[PDB]
Ligand binder design. Structure first.
Ligand SMILES: OC[C@H]1CNC[C@@H](O)[C@@H]1O[C@@H]1O[C@H](CO)[C@@H](O[C@@H]2O[C@H](CO)[C@@H](O[C@@H]3O[C@H](CO)[C@@H](O)[C@H](O)[C@H]3O)[C@H](O)[C@H]2O)[C@H](O)[C@H]1O
Length: 314
């Protein structure tokens, strides 16, 4: 293999990236997107703010651009995300009770219907749980609808799209801890009761030198509930600027994550949360952190690149 795409293809797995469709007009970004990945997810274009800016008025141009990119380049398309507490438009936050429930249901229905037969899998619900266990505490969905909203969302998604793989996605659930235990309980419950649910996403926004040693064990116990698993938003951030030591540790870390996936038969693959450090979300959220991706800000391959290739068995 001479590309990460070839390595993943050869392994029978997915290697994806988070796309900003506006960056496709930057030819270097498009060249790498085209050649190095066999799956794409919209970094932002399919979120609620991006798709339903006012009640029952939809703006699918950006999401369609991502879908068309996937179809044109023959990549799997992964859908992110139907229900998420973050970036929720004010019009939705202003609704309550049944009016809010109906807005959620309408959103799930219209977005899943719009992309039906193009999007292969959806993050139906994103970030429902709390670090330390139990439900997230700053969510409009949890606060207005309570525990049942997750099941409502999954059933609505299946009603709209009978075949798409329906996933729940979260972060800080890579190791076995109170948060991933809560997520595990729900997955087991849903499968026991026949609630539509096909997959679990592990975001894997990790810090350099801190990959959970129990990641494989955790992925495996989820797979054993009878669902697929996926590493959905991998990046491994360090204190900037990078140096040789940090880049080597980061490379080792990428290898650890991709190997954990390789070691679990139902792990569909790994998606990294962007292409280049140039555009990574990390520096804006974490002051003085960054350099989290496989390409640097000048689109040079970092040591992480060879580590990913090696881990896919290339
Ligand atoms: O936080 C990282 C992950 C965590 N898991 C779920 C996953 O969805 C999340 O992704 C991040 O999700 C965040 C919120 O939706 C995104 O951050 C938004 O990213 C947007 C686009 O970069 C930012 O706003 C943009 O600013 C630009 C100014 O040059 C404008 O061009 C855009 O129109 C404007 O929307 C928003 O302030 C910011 O809130 C990040 O790009 C995206 O990487």
């Amino acid at each position: 293999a001479t590309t990460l795409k070839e390595a993943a293809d050869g392994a029978g797995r997915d290697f994806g990236f988070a796309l900003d469709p506006n960056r496709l007009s930057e030819a270097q970004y498009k060249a790498i997107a085209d050649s190095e990945f066999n799956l794409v997810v919209a970094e932002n274009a399919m979120k609620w703010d991006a798709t339903e800016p006012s009640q029952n008025s939809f703006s699918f141009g950006a999401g369609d651009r991502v879908a068309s990119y996937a179809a044109d380049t023959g990549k799997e398309l992964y859908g992110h995300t139907l229900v998420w507490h973050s970036q929720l438009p004010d019009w939705a936050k202003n609704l309550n009770g049944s009016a809010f429930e109906s807005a959620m249901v309408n959103h799930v229905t219209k977005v899943a219907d719009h992309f039906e037969g193009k999007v292969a899998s959806w993050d139906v619900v994103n970030e429902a749980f709390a670090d330390g266990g139990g439900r997230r505490q700053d969510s409009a969905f949890q606060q207005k609808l309570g525990n049942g909203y997750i099941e409502t969302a999954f059933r609505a998604a299946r009603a709209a799209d009978p075949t798409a793989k329906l996933c729940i996605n979260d972060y800080n659930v890579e190791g076995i801890n109170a948060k991933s235990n809560s997520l595990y309980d729900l997955v087991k419950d849903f499968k026991a009761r026949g609630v539509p649910l096909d997959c679990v996403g592990f975001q894997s926004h990790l810090i350099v030198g801190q990959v959970p040693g129990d990641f494989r064990q955790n992925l495996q116990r989820f797979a054993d509930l009878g669902v697929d698993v996926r590493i959905t938003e991998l990046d491994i951030r360090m204190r900037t600027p990078s140096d040789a030591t940090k880049l080597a540790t980061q490379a080792a870390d990428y290898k650890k994550v991709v190997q954990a996936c390789m070691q679990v038969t139902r792990c569909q693959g790994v998606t990294v949360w962007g292409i280049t450090d140039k555009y990574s979300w990390v520096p804006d959220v974490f002051p003085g952190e960054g350099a989290a991706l496989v390409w640097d800000a000048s689109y040079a391959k970092k040591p992480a690149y060879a580590a990913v290739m090696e881990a896919f068995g290339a």
